[PDB]
Symmetry: none
Subunit: 63 residues, 6 copies
DNA sequence: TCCACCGG
DNA sequence: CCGGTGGA
């Protein structure tokens, strides 16, 4: 149950067939960003964060 | 609340300071995988998925 | 004050003039790895870790 | 045990879930900068330092 | 006054009109690498080292 | 051994942990530049030249 | 800042 | 096929 401008942008991403991680949605709520511009920039930043987090290589001492 | 061999692998990622997105944990529980080997393969596959997903490039009608 | 093979690899890095972040050194002690191979792989993972971390873009809400 | 603005900025990075390597902290105590604006710029510069350092490729004479 | 394979590769570099910084030449003499392959490999690494190092950004406390 | 301003700017680069190639130091001394502003501009210019040089790509009759 | 090209 | 680097 989200803000209108939050909904605007999220569907933009749906339109590009991109699932947005749910950690990003959670982070998005606790911010009440006010333009669509800010939402898009916030989300874009978070996608980078998790592109990078997911690339992190796991050391294996077991394997 | 989770399976012993699941908690084993998640703590590997902690030790390596890696955040696992929560969508992955979600999908992980609805699988009851049996060994640590399997759990780890699954998680890895999912990190690739999301690395790719967070990489996908948005088409903007605005910016 | 460290294991001899640890030292062995840390000096390779020094010969190539690459500073190792000290967090890597921390994590490295907590693992008593046994071959020089293992130490190097471990260290190399950790470099990617922090190449990536340091690449994370900060969200500017105040600039 | 640090300056107020130092603390202001480091929690920025914490609210964005970004680890600051501890060599950066070291290097930051050593300058008593006086606005957040300078702290932030200083830290960003050091993140680039280490993104780049960590990217340096090691020459292997052994493997 | 250098090794014959060393001379061999540097000349390659000349034909492509490429200046090798002289710190590389230094680091090169302290390694007596044996094949041309290893020379080229070492030099190539050292090129990346200084491409990166020269990229690092300066923090300016006065300008 | 060098002019005080030369020295002032060189320590800027150290407090940023940046090695200056020694070909830069060389060219630097044969110019006696006067303000620190002039010195830094020079070094920077020179850092670009060599970022660029060290990037130029080798044509290999090896490979 | 975004787009295209080359390398692993 | 994906990731990184360089050029417009």
């Amino acid at each position: 149950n989200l803000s209108a401008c939050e909904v605007a942008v999220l569907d933009l991403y749906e339109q590009s067939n991109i699932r947005i991680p749910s950690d990003i949605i959670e982070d998005l709520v606790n911010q009440r960003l006010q333009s669509e511009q800010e939402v898009l920039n916030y989300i874009e930043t978070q996608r980078t964060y998790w592109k990078l987090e997911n690339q992190k290589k796991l050391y294996r001492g077991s394997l």
